[model samples]
Target chain A: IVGGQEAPRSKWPWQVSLRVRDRYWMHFCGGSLIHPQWVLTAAHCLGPDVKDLATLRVQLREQHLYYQDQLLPVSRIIVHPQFYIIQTGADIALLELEEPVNISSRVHTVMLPPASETFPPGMPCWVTGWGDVDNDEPLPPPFPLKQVKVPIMENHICDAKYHLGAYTGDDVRIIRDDMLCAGNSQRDSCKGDSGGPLVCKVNGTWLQAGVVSWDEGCAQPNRPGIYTRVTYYLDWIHHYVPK
Target chain B: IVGGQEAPRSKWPWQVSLRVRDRYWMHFCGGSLIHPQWVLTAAHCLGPDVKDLATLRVQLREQHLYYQDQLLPVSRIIVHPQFYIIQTGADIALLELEEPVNISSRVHTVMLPPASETFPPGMPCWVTGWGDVDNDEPLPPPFPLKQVKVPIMENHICDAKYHLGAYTGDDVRIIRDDMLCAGNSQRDSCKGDSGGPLVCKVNGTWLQAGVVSWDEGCAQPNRPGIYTRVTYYLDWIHHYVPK
Candidate 1:
């Protein structure tokens, strides 16, 4: 399914469609299932209002909306303590499922990259999400999840694209080591693509490399999409997620 | 002078600014002096109106505008017989100089790469011209020349980005063999940069690889700046220039 020209429906088994249900279910954000009972996402996605977690739902085993999919309640939401701002780094969050999931061909977990694994600059990676489908020129009914390939970029180049410019001796770093930079206008990530998984394949396994966090401006040539580097939080995630 | 953070004046000796005299001199397009008495440029730059050669001028030896520089009248304008539109290939032209230029530190000719030579894709190249100085953010005065380094892109990728998509079956290719593609958003070529030289360094020598011809839009991510591949017309040029 991954190499096919016509993308299959359940191409990404780990793709999690995070939703907020009021009168009807709202496809709010995206995430990745890393453990049978855990979902990895961006800290910024879960705001103060998320404390009332009863409304939060995780949709899986599907590609499009209203497809008779598995929708589970978020049992718990754990955000990084010092992750208030995305630019300053530490913008990762995790969500516990109400019940452990049953691994299947259509529903499963993704491999999380180790801290030692360095996804070098220009390395190809795929980011999957259910963001705005070009607003003006949208899809016909049941909106589908879009997957785009982007190249990993160097921190120095990403730093220069920032408004205040590259970090000096006294100035704080705009793109810290804990942040992963990816995307370009040609093949890219978009505005509402937050909390989605940026995965890189290694030895035929898709390793979750990053969590979509923020960007200067979506599709800006100079500045690419910024994400929370998952490898940087390997120890942190392993500690809380019961490995 | 071109090396420092502040750009040096007259960095490109072969850089020729094509101008049309209205109330004086108006910089129309850019070109490269490949021989003492011949200037290579885009056919589109010299239209039928250029038949009025009395109004055309070629300025050299200076970077900024309104400065003391050597300006020569065109003895003759030779557009490729088949050259009409940029899309159908053959967008090349040459100008016979009124007088042979004397080689100096500031005034010289660029090398024309041989047809056998292949400047591989992703090879670093520099394109120079007097174009919009970021327009919105103006320079101190006399808009100076801008030089930016870009990578040679593969033609197949450029074709796919075109409007109707790449060629299929017996259809004509979007990017013909006579055209060269070079650019990126950060390091790029602009609209007014027509007939400018896209030069690649070989053995520390700058060779005129291409002549800025056409593009879908300025700084487009997918479709890079298209140019008249200089190597493709080596025989066509040597015949006219007596090189």
Candidate 2:
């Protein structure tokens, strides 16, 4: 879901709130529960200051930030070995839960695409988070989570768009093969919402295709949000996560 | 190793440095790696401020604070259900590691005592950490980890000592059945060393008998440091830790 619209509570049951504590617990990023004890997220959302084993909690069956949810403790965080703030790809990370979460209608694991699977360009996909409604606007008070629908764009086309005046010189090759681009001017993820899942429905089943990584800006012309292609890192993810 | 003498590099391989980050990583307390993926610590050492999962890191095979060692990420923290700041016993907690550490000569887990095992009064046990040398002394800078040998004291004897004048009125019965007392006026664990291990050698194997919990003051007359009896919590520990 990438357009600015409210999503149903029952939709996207795998969506999870990756929260961190400051004075209080707040949603820091978005993630997907891929297993009973594992969460898939973006590596950039994690920083040196946010690694406390006690303060980091995961919320399941959460529809609104103001409402109650099942808060679980995080046991470990595994960031990709090649993850770099300056790198365009390899932005994925995994959060291992202390104990397995009880599965129900409101809480469940999302399906990961097989290594051979690929979502072609123009495929409809969804993204969801609690990001701002508009760019540079004051964040609204606690509200229900938002979701939007967007179509996947070819990597070369997205690379060309970003290169046109957005990046020049040595930084022209910003997008890499391991990355995927989705959304358009009318639909995109904003700041305060990264590490979210971009899933596409395939043969009556949903498969995660990308992870929210970076964006030029919300709903900008020819500037869509970039994500880490899940298929590229399937082996790395499975190395740490048990079947 | 209860006094302030420097310990050998491989003497207490199970010793773990439980750290929390403020602006930078700093030691908050001590612990024992009872299993490759589990660390035994004190519940009181954990507070609301240290709940942030991003700020905690557990260091293993560490000796001097100035030197480098294997810094591992914590996956989960399980504090005892009956833990309370003012409580006399049930102060134990377990830290689950994201990945098990590779066993070697410099790093290994400690042996846990059986449920029926007990170390009677006059039995010598060792305690080790980077805590203060004296109550009023400033914490030493980047010094080698210290250890001291102290003898266990009977629970009734320890309870009577606390009842005399240390803890008056309602707090007289501070030493409970699940608590053990050790050390004397000349040797004890001081500030910054809570949650450490109290191991006594039985048949040439070091068995973890207790965990550093609290004291009236470091090594004060007739006031020995109280610990959470490991034998009493064997069942609770096994519930979380796999054989």
Candidate 3:
């Protein structure tokens, strides 16, 4: 269901609205609660304006951004050392909460896949955010969170389609071993939806497989959304977020 | 933590307050949401006063009873055909909601174990309700739901203690094969806590293993709480709710 409707309240409990304070509290990107004190997002979302940790806040337990719930201040931000603004690979980042959130039904963590876990193509996954709903319009009001289900595309197919293409800059590969491709033309993650989760449920437990990273023009035929493959950074994540 | 404190908000999403209307809606017993439209409770909770389905209601998604969230109307009440008032062997019942509830983090279902599943002696399980904090005291305010963790006791041990005991009548065996024994002298389900769930997490999934049936007294020495074994009723439950 591309161009999907609002998600059911509390359906995505781990979905976090990562907002930046630029005079006013504005939601700029999406994130997922990987642990009580840790959140996973895209490194590209850590813009120059968000250099100060005080400028960022993570909201949990509420579906809508208009109504506030539990807001936790970011204590630290760790962008992957290899992440480059010009490249699409290694685009993941982790945010440390100032304090651990009290885990509850509405505020819980999503499971992380094992290092060797690999999701094959055609695996259906869900993406959620308080981002733009229409591709052609300006940013809409952040009332109800939006969600869409899309299938994972084979990396070979994704690279073949986007390699040396319009969105892929000169001599740069559009998809990589550390990236994932999902979604179809009619239903893809759009602008303002960056850093969101691409989660798939396996054996009744939800696992964060991808982080919304880059894309061509929203939902254009043959161009699907790209994500930061989470499995690639499992070691880096565990190093900082040791249980 | 036996004799535990208040549960965090949305901690027990499957825990339900079964209410009846006399002059107003009042919680008389506890239940567990096993499916979108079905709830599991004790047969004794459906007395003559609750014969009218209109008088019964199932509340969910909230810790406080006075502050309502989702109030569901009962469309049907299916008690065990073999349930007898003179004994406590078959003491389970199912309440069907008029409409299926919208599942969310704050409102969801608990897993039911297969008929062959069994928890060994000394297995820890949790019991939750809005019942009295003390055994002999009157009912207190229902602002926050209470929860306690107790270990499962062997059937032989339970039978040896309760058989021909003060609570058991002339020739009736208090503990039966179809029933389960849990809790100890420090923590037990009290009056107004009947029909609640005794849930255990096995391999990360919370399974409803027992249904609160009868007890000698709250946290009494050598008189643990008795529950109707949920695994034994899997076939009977599937007969009405096939999913």
Candidate 4:
């Protein structure tokens, strides 16, 4: 689903779960297989900066929640210095695991924008997260990872919804080019998806397009879903990974 | 400083640090003093409810970067379940420690809300958090904390700035009645302050009025600060900490 479109589950099988520290405890956040080492997410989802480098344990097999071998140990976390929590956009981060993942036909990295690429507004994408069933409730037990289809919104329309005037102040303008906005005209990224992936279809393969950011309410009408635009930050990915 | 506008730190001396959890680690967020057995914060600052009993930990005093017992053990975290994270209002949560803190006057709770409290808009309140100095920086070591002053805004004005509309889907209308928005027309909450107290002067006492919630872009102009209203949830407070 790299071209901002949905695909059957069997097409792209590799899904990831992140163990987020909750006080003295931990909970899972959904992610995807982006590369052998790096996993993508919203900066706010990492908690505070001080806690970033702490180990981010990744779970792969859906059945084995506590399976030892299926878990991946995070070596480090790289968050964009320009990422801001309040503005709620351009909030992106990359997690590098301790070892390279063995990719296969079923488990493989999603496609990425070429070194020079641009996606027009209205691009469709798919978002996957372990977020809440409904906005009011907590994430379901035995965490159910879900995916939804959304369309990217024009920057001007996106800004207008927030009363973000011309993107001058940090408040409205924070949703930058590097970030993409999406949502059904009505539904959206809800409580369970604090830090999840938005994948788009490009050419024949699926590519990572965005990272789910904060929203005002779950599935509110007209208020588009906001995401960290992967295409805008191609330089960042290349600089960090140097692949 | 209990309700006389802003309290000079000299008179009211209890301050504690606020830290956030990353994947498997913890990071500093903001600071608060021993505000009774219940730690005060805006409802929205409370994190996602991934589990039934959300665990909360508190560190009392330990100058070191690493957390030790000097940091108190937080037995419970009671956030207003009604809070909607995206709206930034109705933000409040209380942390109850397994052990009642034992400290001299240096560690006393901030004065409770005054009886018959009324907080008119534009009242100046102090903001404190150990969040990042800017965005994207590793939490500062020992993680120095900072404090600043902000004023409350009228609900209508706040609604306008956040693009809250009448449909109830807009972020503004999503905020509940049990919330108070703080911060000046300019500066607002930063990355680190998820669940810290927003103290406002009511009558002659500076009562813990609200808990800081998420803001778009740190200190962005015209965006008023959002908080969880403490007065509305007074009953919940008394029920949890009955004498």
Model 2: lDDT of residue A124:
70
Query: What is the alpha-carbon lDDT of model 2 when measured against the actual structure?
Result: 0.81
What is the lDDT ranking, best to worst? 2, 3, 1, 4
Q: Write the per-residue lDDT of candidate 3 for residues B1-243, one digit (tens) a residue.
A: 137577888677988988887545678889998999999999988963348888889887566665544567999999887887615578899999999888899779998997788988767789888766667553333346888998898888887767534755645566788998888888888777788899988888898989888743688777788889999999999998868
Candidate 4 chain A least-lDDT 10 residues:
A163-172
lDDT of 3 by residue, A31-111 (tens): 899999999988989953349887789888575563444568988999988887625578889999999999888779989
Q: How close to the true structure is residue B231 of candidate 2, measured as C-alpha lDDT?
A: 92
List the global CA lDDT of all models. 0.74, 0.81, 0.79, 0.57
Superposed Cα deviation of residue B104, candidate 1 (Å): 0.8
The per-model DockQ list reads: 0.01, 0.01, 0.01, 0.03
Best by DockQ: 4
Model 1, B1-243: lDDT tens per residue? 011122367577898889887887877788998889999988888862335788888987576765876679889988776564576667889999999989898789998997886678866688877654432333335667778887887677666555332112123346788888887655566656788898998888788889998733455556678988888998889889885
For model 1 the TM-score comes to 0.47
Query: Tens-digit lDDT track for model 2 on A46-141?
Result: 853447778888887566663565678988999887887725578899999999988898789999998887678757788888776667652343
Please state the error at residue A222 of candidate 4 in Å: 2.8
Separately for all candidates shown, the number of backbone clashes (residues 3 or more apart, or on different chains) is 1, 32, 0, 50
Which lDDT value does model 2 have at A159? Answer: 80
Per-residue lDDT of model 4, residues A36-76, tens digit only? 87777667766443354454577653522333435668887
* Segments in model 1 whose C-alpha atoms lie over 4 Å from true places: A1-243, B1-7, B48-50, B133-140, B163-172
Name the docking class for model 2. Answer: incorrect
TM-score of each: 0.47, 0.49, 0.49, 0.49
State the displacement of the C-alpha of residue B24, model 4, in Å, after optimal TM-score superposition.
42
